[PDB]
Symmetry: C2
Subunit: 238 residues, 2 copies
């Protein structure tokens, strides 16, 4: 396995950030990459072995350290907005030989001007109108998450208390509705029959990752501590 | 018992509204009152018996009917914003002899200019700073419900899955934060010890009563169907 810590992080410009990657594959090579929405997966730094590191394609503003065979760290001495990205660690084989690499789950790192910019979402449920289009339905229910910042969210659906995976259609990425606000929508489809059973329960849940343990909230306001937001509705009669 | 239907209703100006009251006390007298935030409990119409009704203090714009011993209805032929209020039915004894009357649970009726004005709340959790005041704490957690309209909401707290009643301090009434927006806050208090147990789960839940079954959503937008909104957080380590 390949693991990353933290999985999500907000940093203020000029702060120091350390991203650690641990592997249990006893591989000699490790890699740190970033993936920018639009751009490809680019290599920052890599390592051929415990104790050594090499510059990849875009090393500027990053340092790397390989203190043991298992660990590969990425260090951002003075974080800049331009370092906002999704970071991926990998272990394995040769540089560019992707068939031989095993990737970590990724880490979302957002470098912001001020922590007070962190805002959890508003989550709501709506029923789409079939009246509006000549073609079929528009999904049973629509879940809308908006006004949140940064975009470190996970949306899931739950019917009668069990998470669902089928009949779900979530926006692939959050849309920047404004300067420091995002929007995310998802559609759920169930049998009209099912939706008209008032015994059925639907829940749209959004996991929000804001401040971490190690983040000091500037005094003046109460600290936002919200982690999970949910919007629920029961079926309608048939 | 004395029951009321509906318990919550939104109406558009000029629409017709019927509020029904049913009692199982076999009482001869029934009453319909309204309570305005600031004003007292005022009597609209009453009845001394099946088939008859009498004007109370403020009968204007309301009709009443007593079709049987058990039922007492209040009818608003052309609803006006001025009829936005909380309505109470009672059965019993004499007019003004409150010791002899049994009151229903009340009905929130809001007459609005347009149904598109119905918006569910945004619900969030914050930790207050003790640093800010010379006196003690400010409650463990603060729950904030805002941007909702009308004010037909219920807020409840749940710790580890069980609703709580102790250590809770909710705002007595929603505050009109703007023209067609309300705000509601509540504070929860638990032992610092408890809040620092990451095994503990806190949920602030707001029940939103918007559109009813019998409300036709003007086409053009997807209909808001959200009924319960919740903001959750787990304990923090000690």
């Amino acid at each position: 396995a390949v693991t990353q810590s933290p999985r999500n992080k907000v940093a203020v410009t000029g702060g120091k950030v350390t991203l650690s990657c641990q592997q249990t594959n006893n591989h000699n090579n490790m890699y740190w990459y970033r993936q920018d929405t639009g751009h490809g997966l680019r290599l920052i730094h890599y390592s051929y072995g415990a104790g050594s590191t090499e510059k990849g394609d875009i090393p500027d503003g990053y340092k790397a350290s390989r203190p043991s065979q298992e660990q590969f760290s990425l260090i951002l001495e003075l974080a800049t907005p331009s370092q906002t990205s999704v970071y991926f660690c990998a272990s394995g084989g040769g540089r560019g030989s992707y068939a031989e690499q095993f990737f970590g789950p990724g880490t979302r790192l957002t470098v912001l001007e001020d922590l007070r910019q962190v805002t959890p979402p508003k989550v709501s449920l709506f029923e789409p109108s079939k009246a509006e289009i000549a073609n079929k339905q528009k999904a049973t229910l629509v879940c809308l998450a908006r006004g949140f910042f940064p975009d470190h969210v996970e949306l899931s659906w739950w019917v009668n208390g069990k998470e669902v995976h089928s009949g779900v259609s979530t926006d692939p990425q959050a849309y920047k509705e404004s300067n420091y606000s995002y929007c995310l929508s998802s559609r759920l489809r169930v049998s009209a029959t099912f939706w008209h059973n008032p015994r059925n329960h639907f829940r749209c849940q959004v996991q929000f990752h804001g401040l971490s343990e190690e983040d000091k909230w500037p005094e003046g306001s109460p600290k936002p501590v919200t982690q999970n937001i949910s919007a629920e509705a029961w079926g309608r009669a048939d």
